[PDB]
Design a binder for this molecule. Structure first.
Ligand SMILES: CC(=O)N[C@H]1[C@@H](O[C@@H]2[C@H](O)[C@@H](O)[C@H](O)O[C@@H]2CO)O[C@H](CO)[C@@H](O)[C@@H]1O
Ligand SMILES: [Ca+2]
Length: 886
């Protein structure tokens, strides 16, 4: 005691009709709050700060509920104070939770599971404790600085206006990059010089200084970084890729250049990133990871990079002028793992709300990025505005005209303002657009001429409006705010249609990304309309893993495209994640620096030598086998790497793990196994190359995915033939195969689910338990169910971002197969028919577990020996030995 029976109030962010929040605290067990959306929590204010001793919870029925309870004494920080994760049914006695005398003015109760429904409920909640006689403080309003008032503005302007200062900054930064990439002791081995463009093209030079130093010139920072990279790769046998394995072992003495080299690129732009990349890869990155990424960008010639960092603050300021409180803005914006689909106008809300201190921190990170990009000569692509507004925009602005955009994968898309209206009507597109571009400037300053926005992406609705006219007016509005604007536009699945693209009256002030040029190029219709366009390798969908690359097409189609066009202004990468197949990315960026087709085989021979720090005939043999199998040219349409059956919801007739995926392996499996035999034979000699280990894990996990598919077919045959004993034996081998795969995956830091989760939980400074748990939810959901039931199932997103990852394989993929197998076994053995499994409910149970109360996944890779694991795989879980094995 004592029960807090006066002054208690409650809020929620959704409820089913009649089942309002206040019904959780009305003293009546027959009335309840019940959730209507993904906000499955309520917030109770106690009318003062109490030292809490007990919290009692009643539900409306006898289902099994799981929930987490949080408390705040300062009004800002909600820390976790109790939870129920046991499988006990609720009953008429309620659940009583002992609280260790925690001070609290407000509590949050998040009900993350109801065994009986997707909706959750609370019939009553009682809180017991001792009044402190104190009151919560007022919560400080969100406040950020204007760019113009920060030291960032001073520096940005000083760089702009003082050549000498700017040159010194660029040259010092490139020296810093050498230090970060190969070590501080190499900084004094290079001399860097700015030069002019060659014939209007970016250019670098590499030569000997005369006293044993390396003289590298370039027209800007990116060119200088590319020259540094060229020297490493061609003279030092060194290869940098901070995400996908490097060989950074330098020679004992700096090798001589010999004949001076001058190398230019005919491309104005070399472009990087997909909106999706910001979610499947970068969601939880800190500055250190961004810095490393930008160094790798500059070294690979990249000078145009999609940038959404801190855009939440831009949108907050914009909507604040159109009747939205900061709380309402936070409900509209997604969580940290969903910004890709938030900014592509596909979804709102989900994974949020973001913490109040998000906005300042992210605006600061964005400013820091623009400072580094400015030093290098990298253009960010910031945001264009095309009419995106929340669905209640007219409620708050009654003269606005809007077009409902309908649904995307079960989410509600935001509305779109009518891009033009009749004489006599208010034009909110003009009004909001003017505020948006002005607020973007207040937050970041004038950092670029490139802006990206993509109305009608993967659906939406043009209403009564003329397609060309919509594009004309959006383009005109962008140009009004930046006379030198270039509207960067994604070309995907025929959006924007020719009639839309013909609306762009200023063709030189648009630039279309041909998104998927290495599989389904679609630049002819751009070229024919005289639109500047960029040739892009997409390659990676969802972060889905496997050996997959198109090196022959990259070595040939790119210079062919250049030879056969007048408006190809660049090449680039548009991957949905940067986690796989380093060969593809290195080759793509190498193709910027030639006008000629090259030989992709000899290119690979040189590539693997610098990647491993050594080579021999057998390693070269194994890579020729990879080029002839997994990396062999394909002429069909497919999205990402062939999917592992291990990662699919269990069932019969499986042909993909994700809706738009494919599991068909188009090469000979036993032939591919030979590459693994060759790597095992050479393991001891190459184990001191981390990049060799990286590649060996990739090909080995590919072998096991490949053989798992064959064992799956045999297992399904055994069930269909009513052979219980054979099914037990074969399904048994299938599960053991997954266990071996888990040992393979354990060997790489890049494969640990624990790193992804820990990054999410630690990405901000000083965040409360509430925010950590919510960010962990974002991390777990994105790689599994993606959204909730109507998104995963009816919406098609289940396992879209499936990862061949350690921890995730044991507790999620393995657990699904085991469950399906056991049900089939029980039936074959004479038991009841195998039950339907509700996959989403089982999957979601995993999504909602927390690292601090359930299981903490490790952040350290194992010492398993990939050579020995490969021998076990060849001997006991292979396609080659399958007849012998089964
Ligand atoms: C969920 C996701 O990352 N979607 C991507 C993806 O779209 C999916 C698929 O590739 C399309 O063929 C299908 O029409 O829609 C799918 C679900 O959105 O690819 C595109 C292209 O990069 C992305 O824009 C989506 O965001
Ligand atoms: Ca009640």
């Amino acid at each position: 005691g004592v029960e807090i029976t006066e002054g208690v109030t409650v809020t929620a962010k959704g409820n089913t009709e009649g089942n309002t929040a206040d019904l959780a605290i009305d003293g009546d067990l027959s009335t309840y709050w019940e959730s209507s959306n993904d906000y499955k929590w309520i917030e109770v204010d106690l009318g003062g700060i109490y030292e809490l001793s007990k919290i009692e919870i009643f539900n409306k029925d006898e289902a099994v509920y799981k929930y987490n309870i949080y408390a705040s004494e300062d009004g800002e920080n909600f820390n976790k104070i109790a939870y129920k994760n046991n499988d006990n049914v609720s009953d008429s006695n309620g659940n009583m939770h002992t609280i260790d005398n925690v001070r609290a003015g407000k509590i949050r109760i998040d009900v993350v599971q109801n065994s009986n429904s997707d909706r959750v409920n609370i019939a009553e909640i009682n809180v017991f404790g001792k009044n402190t006689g104190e009151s919560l403080p007022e919560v400080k309003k969100i406040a950020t600085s204007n760019f113009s008032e920060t030291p960032w503005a001073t520096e940005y302007e000083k760089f702009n206006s003082d050549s000498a200062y700017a040159n010194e900054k660029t040259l010092n930064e490139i020296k810093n990059l050498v230090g970060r990439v190969i070590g501080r002791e190499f900084k004094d081995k290079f001399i860097f010089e700015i030069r002019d463009q060659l014939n209007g093209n970016d250019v670098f030079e590499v030569s000997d200084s005369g006293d044993g130093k390396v003289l590298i010139k370039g027209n800007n920072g990116v060119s200088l970084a590319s020259g540094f990279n060229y020297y490493l790769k061609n003279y030092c046998n060194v290869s940098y890729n901070p995400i996908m394995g490097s060989n950074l072992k330098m020679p004992e003495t700096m090798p001589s250049v010999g004949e001076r080299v001058v190398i230019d690129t005919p491309y104005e732009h070399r472009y990087a990133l997909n909106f999706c990349t910001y979610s499947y890869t970068m969601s939880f990155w800190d500055w250190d990871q961004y810095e490393e990424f930008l160094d790798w960008c500059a070294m690979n010639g990249v000078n145009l990079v999609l940038d959404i960092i801190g855009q939440e603050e831009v949108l907050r300021r914009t909507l604040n002028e159109f009747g939205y409180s900061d709380e309402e803005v936070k409900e509209f914006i997604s969580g940290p793992a969903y910004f890709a689909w938030f900014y592509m106008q596909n979804m709102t809300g989900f994974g949020g709300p973001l913490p109040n201190d998000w906005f300042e921190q992210r605006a600061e990170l964005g400013r820091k990025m623009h400072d580094r990009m400015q030093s290098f000569g990298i253009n960010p692509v910031l945001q264009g505005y095309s009419g995106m507004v929340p669905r209640d925009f007219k409620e708050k602005n009654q003269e606005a005209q809007t077009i409902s955009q309908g649904g995307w994968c079960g989410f509600d898309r935001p509305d779109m303002l009518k891009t033009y209206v009749n004489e006599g009507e208010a034009d909110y597109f003009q009004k909001v657009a003017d505020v948006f571009y002005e607020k973007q400037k207040e937050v970041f300053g004038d950092v670029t001429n490139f802006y990206g926005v993509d109305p009608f992406h993967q659906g939406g609705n043009t209403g009564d409006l003329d397609n060309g006219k919509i594009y004309e007016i959006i383009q005109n509005k962008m140009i009004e705010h930046d006379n030198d604007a270039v509207w960067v536009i994604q070309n995907w699945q025929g959006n924007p249609s020719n009639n839309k693209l013909e609306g762009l009256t200023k063709k030189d002030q648009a630039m279309v990304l041909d998104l998927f040029s290495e599989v389904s190029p679609d630049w002819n219709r751009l070229e024919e309309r005289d639109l500047p366009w960029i040739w892009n390798m997409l390659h990676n969908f969802g972060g889905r893993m496997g050996m997959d690359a198109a090196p022959e097409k990259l070595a040939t189609e790119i210079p062919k495209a250049l030879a056969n066009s007048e408006h190809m202004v660049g090449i680039g990468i548009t991957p949905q994640a940067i986690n796989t197949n380093p060969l593809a990315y290195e080759l793509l960026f190498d193709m910027a620096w030639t006008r000629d087709q090259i030989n992709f085989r000899t290119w690979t021979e040189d590539y693997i030598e610098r990647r491993y720090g050594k080579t021999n005939k057998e390693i070269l043999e194994a890579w020729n086998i990879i080029l002839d199998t997994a990396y062999k040219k394909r002429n069909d349409y497919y999205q990402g790497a062939a999917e592992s059956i291990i990662n699919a919801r269990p069932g019969f007739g499986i042909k993909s793990a994700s809706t738009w995926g494919h599991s068909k392996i188009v090469y000979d499996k036993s032939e591919f196994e030979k590459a693994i035999e060759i790597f095992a034979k050479n393991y001891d000699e190459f184990k001191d190359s981390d990049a060799f280990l990286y590649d060996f894990a990739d090909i080995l996990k590919q072998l096991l995915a490949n053989s798992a598919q064959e064992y799956y077919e045999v297992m399904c045959n055994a069930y269909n033939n009513g052979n219980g004993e054979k099914f037990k034996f074969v399904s048994g081998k299938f599960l053991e195969l997954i266990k071996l795969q888990e040992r393979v995956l354990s060997t790489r830091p890049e494969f640990l689910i624990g790193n992804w989760i820990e990054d999410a939980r630690t990405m901000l400074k000083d965040s409360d338990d509430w925010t950590k748990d919510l960010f962990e939810f974002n991390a777990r959901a994105l790689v599994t169910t993606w959204g909730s039931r109507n998104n995963a199932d009816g919406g098609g997103l289940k396992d879209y971002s499936n990862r061949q990852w350690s921890g995730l394989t044991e507790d999620y993929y393995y657990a699904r197969w085991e469950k399906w197998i056991n049900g089939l076994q029980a039936e074959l053995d004479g038991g009841a028919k195998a039950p339907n499994i509700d996959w989403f409910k089982m999957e979601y149970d995993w999504v909602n577990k927390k690292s601090d109360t359930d299981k903490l996944y490790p952040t350290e890779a194992s010492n398993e020996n990939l050579g020995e694991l490969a021998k076990i795989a060849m001997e006991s879980y292979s396609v080659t030995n399958m007849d012998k094995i089964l």
